[model samples]
Target: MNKEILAVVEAVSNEKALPREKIFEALESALATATKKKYEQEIDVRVQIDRKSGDFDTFRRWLVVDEVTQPTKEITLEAARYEDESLNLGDYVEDQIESVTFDRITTQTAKQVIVQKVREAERAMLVPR
Candidate 1:
């Protein structure tokens, strides 16, 4: 199952002629959004896949700020810093959670997201640096 993740990344990167990092970013977004669907509340989620092992980690996070108006999506810096002194305002505080299994729906979402991301990347290239 893990190997399948890396294989998909490699295949898509090769087919699109896009950077591997770009594909990884798109996949992360794909997985994160798909995971979010399972939750009832609007929560911030982040996903990171190990490039070598193809294993991925899911994180539920909140943005740290002086004032947390949105309790579900933001945390006060004071509370965040208690867990990790390094946490600062404007930074994200994440808790690792179980990752969702990759299934047919997830695969379809990933494809759409990757295509959208690649289009954005290609368009960016045409802009003058």
Candidate 2:
């Protein structure tokens, strides 16, 4: 699902005096983790946010199967056809993540993951206690 706007990253970055890139990466990385748990874990997951537009896209990938027994990891040839008619068997297809699928903004994994990421980055950049 598109993240509407990414003002939070900028807001958080400014609040903590951290680089935008660092905060942006942390947010995207944390989101990717939740999407995995919310959606298909076995599928390869990737998250991208347009720095200028502040739009985010999450993608879940699955391998095409001639006959799928594991519904989550493999898509049947017929199912894959809906996404791409030209795709032959064994080809992979990716779909954009949606709010309905993920259920909520980040579920239970959002805040905890980002907090840890921020703490780690802070400790790494600052002198250790």
User: Scored by CA lDDT, what does every candidate get?
Assistant: 0.79, 0.66
Q: Where in model 2 is the C-alpha error above 4 Å?
A: 1-5, 61-103, 106-111, 126-129
* Candidate 1: tens digits of C-alpha lDDT, residues 1-129: 577677778888899877777788888887888677778467788999888867778888988889898867788999899868799988888788678765434455577877888777766775445
**Considering every candidate listed, which one attains the maximal lDDT?**
1
Q: What is the lDDT for 59 in model 1?
A: 86
Give candidate 1 misplaced runs (Cα > 4 Å).
103-108, 126-129
Per-residue error for 96 in candidate 2, Å, reads: 5.3
Listed in order, each prediction's TM-score against the native is: 0.81, 0.53
lDDT per residue, candidate 2, 8-65, as tens digits? Answer: 6656667767777876677677666666777654555667767686665777767788
Worst 10 residues of 1 by lDDT: 101-110
- Root-mean-square deviation of Cα positions for candidate 2 versus the true structure, in angstroms: 5.8
Q: lDDT for model 2, please.
A: 0.66
